[PDB]
Amino acid sequence: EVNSFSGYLKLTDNVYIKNADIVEEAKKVKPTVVVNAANVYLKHGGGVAGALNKATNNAMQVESDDYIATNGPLKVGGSCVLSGHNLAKHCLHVVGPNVNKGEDIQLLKSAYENFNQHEVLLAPLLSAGIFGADPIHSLRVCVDTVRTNVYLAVFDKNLYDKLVSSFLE
Ligand SMILES: CC(C)[C@H](Nc1ncnc2[nH]c(-c3cnc(N)nc3)cc12)c1ccc2c(c1)S(=O)(=O)CCC2
């Protein structure tokens, strides 16, 4: 079965959300596209990106280093399409702004705009966690920006509950 997402709550006609680890979702669903919460040099050193790379047994990091060698770093708000390895057909590496490192929160709209080149995506909540954006604001930017079908996996039940309550106000 293709893109067999299960147990998501539909927020709008094109945005769904689940309390889940994106890595476990990707292994089960094998979506057409999994989004990585990348940085501009595609160094998957921790957090979501480190977890996705570990699930590929470091194949994602080797492929990422070869992309950077030929093409140079991404821009904040930009993306590139690379292999999905065992997690998906493709991985869309998207760079959201890291507010904790002084990057402009307005670039979060540009970051989500990359999703619109793909019909169906499994994605994390961009710029949340240690990137420092307000996660309720990130969900609002996602809902207002993404027009294709996005399945958000948020690996924290406390945050999931706050996000759903924030949406349903
Ligand atoms: C807001 C968080 C709950 C959310 N976390 C997550 N959301 C979804 N699937 C996840 N798997 C893991 C995980 C981590 N480590 C191991 N070993 N396995 C899986 C984390 C996780 C999240 C959302 C976006 C960002 C981050 C974190 S970050 O990594 O701090 C910086 C980049 C942007």
Side-chain angles (χ1 to χ4, degrees):
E1 10 278 313
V2 176
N3 288 318
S4 313
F5 296 100
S6 57
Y8 283 72
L9 178 61
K10 183 178 189 60
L11 297 180
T12 68
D13 284 349
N14 68 293
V15 177
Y16 300 84
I17 192 168
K18 190 179 179 179
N19 168 36
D21 177 358
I22 193 170
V23 173
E24 298 301 317
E25 287 295 298
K27 294 189 295 191
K28 194 142 183 126
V29 174
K30 53 269 216 149
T32 303
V33 177
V34 64
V35 172
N36 180 31
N39 57 36
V40 298
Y41 284 87
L42 302 185
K43 290 299 193 182
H44 310 309
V48 169
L52 286 166
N53 176 57
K54 180 177 181 212
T56 77
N57 296 73
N58 205 51
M60 173 184 288
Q61 185 66 73
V62 174
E63 179 197 27
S64 291
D65 289 350
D66 172 81
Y67 168 87
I68 292 286
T70 299
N71 298 276
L74 284 69
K75 293 294 284 174
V76 177
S79 69
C80 71
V81 180
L82 294 175
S83 178
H85 302 278
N86 49 301
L87 299 182
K89 181 183 189 166
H90 302 285
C91 177
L92 180 72
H93 295 267
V94 177
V95 185
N98 186 331
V99 166
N100 289 328
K101 302 301 181 181
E103 298 170 358
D104 186 359
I105 190 57
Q106 295 186 102
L107 291 167
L108 188 54
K109 178 164 209 58
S110 301
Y112 280 115
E113 278 174 347
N114 295 285
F115 289 26
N116 288 326
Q117 318 307 342
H118 299 280
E119 275 302 310
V120 179
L121 313 91
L122 168 65
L125 189 69
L126 298 180
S127 294
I130 77 168
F131 276 33
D134 181 331
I136 287 176
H137 174 63
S138 183
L139 178 60
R140 291 208 194 105
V141 178
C142 184
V143 166
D144 291 343
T145 306
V146 182
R147 294 186 189 160
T148 57
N149 305 298
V150 58
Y151 291 81
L152 292 169
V154 175
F155 191 26
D156 177 341
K157 178 56 170 159
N158 305 292
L159 180 59
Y160 172 89
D161 284 351
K162 283 184 171 58
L163 289 171
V164 172
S165 172
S166 87
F167 176 85
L168 297 175
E169 289 170 358

